[PDB]
Design a protein around this ligand. Structure first.
Ligand SMILES: [Cl-]
Lengths: 93, 107, 512, 86, 95, 98, 88, 107, 93
DNA sequence: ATCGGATGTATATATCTGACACGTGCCTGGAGACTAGGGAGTAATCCCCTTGGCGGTTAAAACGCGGGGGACAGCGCGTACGTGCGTTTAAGCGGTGCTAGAGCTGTCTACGACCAATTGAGCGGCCTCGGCACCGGGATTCTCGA
DNA sequence: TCGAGAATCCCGGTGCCGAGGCCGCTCAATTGGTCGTAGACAGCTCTAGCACCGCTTAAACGCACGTACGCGCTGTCCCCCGCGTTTTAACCGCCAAGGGGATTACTCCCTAGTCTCCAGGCACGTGTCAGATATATACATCCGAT
């Protein structure tokens, strides 16, 4: 048994970007699938980068390159900004 | 000995422990950096917020509260960057963006 | 005379021990140290080590009767040297001073070869494309009873010409340009050449140059090299020249380089001149000087400008991918984009003070215009030459410019009008290594040399455009350099190269 | 199963159904031979997808086709589907 | 009585504003589970599996007609013909 | 009079010539220079390999040939033989590239 | 003289000459060509090259190098989904 | 004892040992079986033999003795399944199939 | 700088299907790329396929299903038979 | 050019049902030591790249002209589509019933990981001679203007 | 509609350089053994899938009627092709010197993995009530003849 999901986290983000709306179950399923999809796509690209460069580990730099290589333009720069923000905040704690 | 989750330590809402576990147990590389989960969680949270805001705006436009696959579809298609990202993705029970070719209209 | 005898003489129907041994004994006639190279080669090549332990005063006093044009005294002995070279089963270099008379000298030698040794061809003469027509002219002039052709044109043109004359065997000498040789290497690869003559042998310095390789594959007995200046940069250039001359004797670069290696130097030189003595002659322009007053040289160790200095420092610290910019910086900042602010683009005086060398150049041209001289600026950037063009326009002087990309018709009309009877052309811009050696700028007498080169020989040829025969008052070199700059490094390297050339060759013509 | 295996089930994708799909696609006027072409292309697409889904479900040593199997087949053929797990 | 074109445009606007499935359910279920007997006999199908198949195929067909229409218009027509679908699939890379 | 081929027979000759050889049709230096100029928009102080540009030219020429084939198909569908920018636009639009 | 700028250079996309577009179109198998095709072709080629070079640069930048490699271009093309055989 | 390679044991021409090492180190799974490299090498060898046979056929129809990228291209494009498998692949220095639309032919 | 490549095995296969026929070098490099491509596609499919069923090994079953998924029809059944034959011979030896 | 119909689009009101808050078990994520090996750093070292310019050959590309056929428009006509209206059909839905087969749980054993030794396969370096590219010239084939 | 007439296919002679053997060495397959843990198999259980059945009503089918639209035809410009000068720029060969950019050896430290415990974060299962459907009536609005 024992099936996991991202529904709790998607709901937590939603009720801070639009703290009045809800979300249907089908929509929550769609958003969960979307998150898993993007996670798979970025992780695959990062692993392939590691394989190309003979490195044996996935690191924040490889995640950053994979993001710049998957997302289009404006999304790329915004996402990179927030990724670096979170990383520095975390490591200074 | 206070149990401070990395997810809170980084200031995110998405889980960083779960992302790290998926990276380790997902057959991506032998070793996984320390900040890699934090970065990837940040990116996922950003993308989720970006899509979810447009979906909520569309839901308000249709004067409804709870967002639905139709609203997600509208957000993705009306936006251009998300539409380029999800170029080959079909969204179940979504719809089609309303569009009628000009020639077909009456004179 | 007999075309069919020539036909069986030319085509090749199929370890030259005897002549090779004759040349080793001829060499060991002089001091045995000259057999160092031979013994090294023998120790490395087994096929000649067994050879070593096997152990006509044709002064030709008078000018050749068969050729007209009574000969000037100094080159009869050159003829004799060539003849002796021939009847010694060895090759040689002739390296006169670009004007002492070399085409005539070689043609006299060829005439002697034909009319006293009874051998009407075959001979090959390879020249730069500029001087091809000349060769035909003097061969038709001095010894008119001979046949040749320029061997040039379109594809089918050379094809028909070779099938008519070359493999038709209707020639005594054939003259062709370097690129022709590299292109028509097939038919000329089987002619059983008597001689191969190269004028301006600079082209063969790098052995790996494709022309050099194609030259090694040709079939001939003896080779003759005609040139102006050997050893532009290093001894390895003479190494390659001697490889081509005598491949058997000279076959180890490492021996040459190590055993010479630049008092240990005095111990080297006392060997050095002896080794090469029976291979190449160098005349002096002062032999039958009779003219060109020596060149008057000078240097103007200019400083730098405020923008010039800021740009220089800006490049010292860190789109720009070379140290060459540093020479660019000292030349004129407008070469970069990021000076001459605007853009409104004025021709005004904001030039001369803006760069350093421009100020002194302006002063000199003032002092020379106000007395009646003409100038031959020789910078080494065509693009920079355009800035001098604009500046000259501002002061409203009269151009005549030959860049690297000026078509030959423009070249000839420009040199004509500038060298026409007295006209209004104060300045003559030009880029250093351009035009070849046939330019006859004897009108002017100022050879200001805005930029300097990595080797002195290019400069010397540049001064030769006005120090050649003709101009008979004086010549004024005015090389410029910015102190505390990389051009000091370039200048010192060039000067020490010139010293090395002095030591190696310019003691030979003292004897010669 | 013992379901009395049937043929000519493609005609169940009827003319009004094809017309409605065309209208959603934005098509005003439709010729009369387009329905057979539509049935052919639908049959081909279904055959590909169902073949891959059956391959997955049979490798897993199962006997029931699952939504995950269909989703994997679609993702394999390049038609990623959101909403049915993933 | 409306004129040819009017009711077609009304239907276009209706169906681009809805979200439901345009093909029936039992007919598509029968078609799927009798295509599938060419690869292995006696299969069972999750209801979610049949629904996923239907949604995917309807999406595919709608996106196909959406390009058949451009092919028809580019040829200076407003009627879609089998040659238009053949061209659409040919260019799209299927055939 | 000097004889003249009717309009349409040199074009077929060239089709059946170029559709049988294998060399590169775009020149070399112009394409390499274009590649430099496009690239220095993203990162300044960058250099390429000759093999890198060669691969890039292979890919691009293949892309353009395959684009022109579908362009021709669209033009024939339009009951023409001349290919017009409308055809490029339709081919790129259908194929999902725009 | 105001001529120390010396050209505008038709900068670079008009280096894909109309005979070259004609050759590519013949190899594609077309008989007659309109006069405006030689500008659509340039536009679409520029788009394709930009998309490829962006990813090749990103790869060679992540590898901490300063030179772009045939392998990087191959990876970029495969990433776009245009696998190219023959360059390792 | 005496060494006896896994390729010889299998009867293959492709390196089972190298396939096994690549499969382990390629980050594909935690463990690899023993029959996996054998199966994979056999399949790769079959595909190579098919394509090379077709290419050689073409090179002999051309009346030359060596396979070149032109023959590789021409053999792949002329086989239905072999070309289906390689739709999104471009052979470097290959070519195109001789093909002219009929409508473009002279009357 | 030892660099491995499927050159000699391709040449061994060639010398038995057309015993007198050469292969220049660019054809060989193309064939090396093709072998690598196909290996990557099959191994990636097998990785995914094992992961979906929670398995941790890659077995000949995963490889067989991957080749059945990626190859078209008649080209797939021959490869399946060849692979099974090789496995049986190796396991019997 | 306006009425008359037909189809939206609001606005009210009633009924559901499925988001959503809340508690409950537990399992996983966190905390804290130890360690080893990956990767960062240093330094050879060497080989291809950069900048600016020169010289020459030779096809391609550019450009201008005539003129031919194709694109585009307009006209006509005759089907094949769309729109309505009865009539029949079968999908949708609620409901019952049964059982095959997903999905978990336990044991254990065969089989893959890991290691040390050992030895041939394979890779790089190197030499050579046939395959194929190219070049006349001769004959043959398709275009085309009578 | 047949004899130009040019383009192509096809023969030999080069020649040259790359494929293809051959050898040394080195390092990664192979052998033999240790051993721990996935997976294989059985058994259980209980969920969901298949199988019908009756009833309603909405969608499908069939047939009619009449336009408007697709296609064929006829001109007619005009713009693209074929061809003959004419210029230009790719493409080799060169010079000159750097240096900097990639690429092996070599050391070492610090950051991952690996462990052992253990408590809160998160998922499951529950009980609501309010945001969605789902009728109804009435007003607005295109659309189509007049
Ligand atoms: Cl002279």
């Amino acid at each position: 048994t024992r099936k996991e999901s991202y529904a709790i986290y998607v709901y937590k983000v939603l009720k801070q970007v639009h703290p009045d709306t809800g979300i249907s179950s089908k929509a929550m399923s769609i958003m969960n699938s979307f998150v898993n999809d993007v996670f798979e796509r970025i992780a695959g690209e990062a692993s392939r980068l590691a394989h190309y460069n003979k490195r044996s580990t996935i690191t924040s730099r490889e995640i950053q390159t994979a993001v710049r290589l998957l997302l289009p333009g404006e999304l790329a720069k915004h996402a990179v900004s927030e990724g670096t923000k979170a990383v520095t905040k975390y490591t200074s704690a | 000995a206070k149990a401070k989750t990395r997810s809170s330590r980084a200031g995110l809402q998405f889980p960083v422990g779960r992302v790290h576990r998926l990276l380790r147990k997902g057959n991506y590389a032998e070793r996984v950096g320390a900040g890699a989960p934090v970065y990837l969680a940040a990116v996922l949270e950003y993308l989720t917020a970006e899509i979810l805001e447009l979906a909520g705006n569309a839901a308000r436009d249709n004067k409804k509260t709870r967002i639905i696959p139709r609203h997600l579809q509208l957000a993705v298609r009306n936006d251009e960057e998300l539409n380029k990202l999800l170029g080959r993705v079909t969204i179940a029970q979504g719809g089609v963006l309303p569009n009628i070719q000009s020639v077909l209209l009456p004179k | 005379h007999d075309p069919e005898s020539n036909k069986k003489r030319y085509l090749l129907k199929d370890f030259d021990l005897e002549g090779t041994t004759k040349r080793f004994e001829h060499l060991l006639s002089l001091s045995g140290l000259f057999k160092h190279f031979i013994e090294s080669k023998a120790a490395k090549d087994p096929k000649f080590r067994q050879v070593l332990d096997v152990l006509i005063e044709f002064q030709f006093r008078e000018s050749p009767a068969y050729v007209n044009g009574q000969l000037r005294p100094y080159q009869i002995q050159g003829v004799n040297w060539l003849v002796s070279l021939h009847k010694n089963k060895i090759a040689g270099i002739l390296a006169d001073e670009m004007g002492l008379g070399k085409t005539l000298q070689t043609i006299s030698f060829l005439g002697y070869l034909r009319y006293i040794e009874k051998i009407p061809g075959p001979f090959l003469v390879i020249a730069p494309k500029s001087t091809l027509n000349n060769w035909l002219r003097e061969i038709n002039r001095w010894t008119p009873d001979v046949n040749a052709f320029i061997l040039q044109g379109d594809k089918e043109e050379r094809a028909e010409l070779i099938q008519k004359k070359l493999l038709g065997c209707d020639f005594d000498v054939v003259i062709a340009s370097y690129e022709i040789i590299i292109r028509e290497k097939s038919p000329l690869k089987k002619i059983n050449w008597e001689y191969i003559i190269i004028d301006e042998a600079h082209r063969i310095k790098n052995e790996e140059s494709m022309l050099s390789q194609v030259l090694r594959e040709f079939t001939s007995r003896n080779r003759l090299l005609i040139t102006g200046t050997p050893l532009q940069n290093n001894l390895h250039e003479l190494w390659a020249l001697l490889n081509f001359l005598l491949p058997d004797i000279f076959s180890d670069a490492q021996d040459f380089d190590d055993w010479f290696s630049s008092e240990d130097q005095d111990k080297i030189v006392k060997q050095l001149h002896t080794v090469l003595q029976p291979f190449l002659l160098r005349r002096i322009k002062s032999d039958v000087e009779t003219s060109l007053l020596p060149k008057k040289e000078l240097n103007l160790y200019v400083g730098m400008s405020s923008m010039q200095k800021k740009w220089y420092k800006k490049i010292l610290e860190k789109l720009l991918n070379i140290m060459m910019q540093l020479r660019k910086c000292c030349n004129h900042p407008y070469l970069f984009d990021g000076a001459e602010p605007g853009p409104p683009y004025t021709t005004d005086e904001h030039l001369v003070y803006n760069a350093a060398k421009l100020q002194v150049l302006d002063k000199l041209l003032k002092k020379l215009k106000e007395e009646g001289s003409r100038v031959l600026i020789f910078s080494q950037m065509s693009r920079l030459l355009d800035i001098l063009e604009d500046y000259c326009y501002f002061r409203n002087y009269e151009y005549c410019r030959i860049d690297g990309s000026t078509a030959h018709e423009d070249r000839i009309q420009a040199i004509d009008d500038y060298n026409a009877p007295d006209s209004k052309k104060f300045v003559f811009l030009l880029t250093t290594r351009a035009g070849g050696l046939g330019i006859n700028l004897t009108s002017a007498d100022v050879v200001v040399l805005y930029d300097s080169d990595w080797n002195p020989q290019a400069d010397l040829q540049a001064m030769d455009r006005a120090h050649r025969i003709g101009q008979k008052k004086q010549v004024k070199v005015f090389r410029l350099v910015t102190d505390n700059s990389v051009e000091e490094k370039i200048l010192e390297r060039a000067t020490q190269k010139l010293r090395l050339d002095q030591l190696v060759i310019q003691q030979n013509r003292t004897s010669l | 199963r013992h379901r009395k295996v049937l043929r000519d089930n493609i005609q169940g994708i009827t003319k009004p159904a094809i017309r409605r799909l065309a209208r959603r696609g934005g098509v005003k006027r439709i010729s009369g031979l387009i329905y057979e072409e539509t049935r052919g292309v639908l049959k081909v697409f279904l055959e590909n997808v169902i073949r891959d889904a059956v391959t997955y479900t049979e490798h897993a040593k199962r006997k029931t086709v699952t939504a995950m199997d269909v989703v994997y087949a679609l993702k394999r053929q390049g038609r990623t589907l959101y909403g049915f797990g993933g | 009585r409306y004129r040819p074109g009017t009711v077609a445009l009304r239907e276009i606007r209706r169906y681009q504003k809805s979200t439901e499935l345009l093909i029936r359910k039992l007919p598509f279920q029968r078609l799927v589970r009798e295509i599938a007997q060419d690869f292995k006999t006696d299969l069972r199908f999750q209801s979610s599996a049949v629904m996923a198949l239907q949604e995917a195929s309807e999406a595919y067909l709608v996106a196909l007609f959406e390009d058949t229409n451009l092919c028809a218009i580019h040829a200076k027509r407003v009627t879609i013909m089998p040659k238009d679908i053949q061209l659409a699939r040919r260019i799209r890379g299927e055939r």
